Amino acid sequence: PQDLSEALKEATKEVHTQAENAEFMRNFQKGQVTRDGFKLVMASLYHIYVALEEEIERNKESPVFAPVYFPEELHRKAALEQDLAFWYGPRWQEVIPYTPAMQRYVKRLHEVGRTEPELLVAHAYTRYLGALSGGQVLKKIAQKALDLPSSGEGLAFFTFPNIASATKFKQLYRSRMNSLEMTPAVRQRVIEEAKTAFLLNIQLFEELQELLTH
Numbered sequence: 001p002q003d004l005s006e007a008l009k010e011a012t013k014e015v016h017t018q019a020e021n022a023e024f025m026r027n028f029q030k031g032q033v034t035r036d037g038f039k040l041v042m043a044s045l046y047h048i049y050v051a052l053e054e055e056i057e058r059n060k061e062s063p064v065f066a067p068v069y070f071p072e073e074l075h076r077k078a079a080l081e082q083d084l085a086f087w088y089g090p091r092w093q094e095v096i097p098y099t100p101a102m103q104r105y106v107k108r109l110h111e112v113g114r115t116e117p118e119l120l121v122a123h124a125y126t127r128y129l130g131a132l133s134g135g136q137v138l139k140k141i142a143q144k145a146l147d148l149p150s151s152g153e154g155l156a157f158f159t160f161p162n163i164a165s166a167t168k169f170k171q172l173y174r175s176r177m178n179s180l181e182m183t184p185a186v187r188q189r190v191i192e193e194a195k196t197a198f199l200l201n202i203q204l205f206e207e208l209q210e211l212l213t214h
């Protein structure tokens with residue numbers, strides 16, 4: 001259209017469906033994910049968000065990213081660390097897995113963070129705006145399914161405590177994106193990188209899936 005925000009939303013409409021329909025994402029929606037599989041995604045989110053957030057601290061002051069810099073509001077690193085300690089034990093840093101589908105995603109994140117920063121925004125957008133436009137169902141089914149004891153831990157990642165209204169924030173973010181300066185080329189690329197994002201995720205589920213069935 002004419003809004004960076006409306007462009008992406010639409011551009012990734014199809015791939016998003018591809019993401020939803022993943023064999024591992026659908027088994028989840030239908031609430032049939034074992035503690036093992038759930039323990040895999042948490043370990044995936046951790047590696048992705050550390051890379052993501054790390055590259056964000058690199059371009060925090062950069063004009064290409066500064067406008068969407070919201071550390072308190074969004075940063076998930078600490079949230080995932082807390083969760084991962086519950087899921088793997090005080091030794092999670094030592095035990096947790098690091099698969100090749102995780103490695104690609106992390107690798108892409110850094111290439112972008114250093115040679116194509118103007119694109120970092122597409123990933124931030126996908127991760128943060130994604131898990132903010134829909135983190136309720138991910139929690140709703142997470143809760144019921146796993147039915148872990150009354151431990152009160154392991155799912156912090158799903159609660160952005162520093163945002164009262166998701167509605168208003170998602171609105172501030174789109175405003176800030178739409179305010180990002182970028183040449184027609186860069187724009188088409190950023191949109192293209194948002195697709196890249198989804199493919200890294202979709203490719204991730206599939207790899208976590210084959211991993212379960214062993």
Ligand code: HEM
Nearest residue numbers: 005008009019020025029125126127129130131133134201
């Ligand atoms: C159970 C699986 C999923 C379901 C059913 C789901 C559902 C949705 C829904 C209904 C919205 C609100 C869209 C709107 O009305 O504007 C949304 C937005 C979005 N989702 Fe998901 N989603 C899922 C998986 C994913 C995955 C894996 C990602 C990737 C990180 C993701 C990224 C996004 C993004 C970026 C948006 C917002 C786009 C925008 O605001 O322009 N979603 N999702």
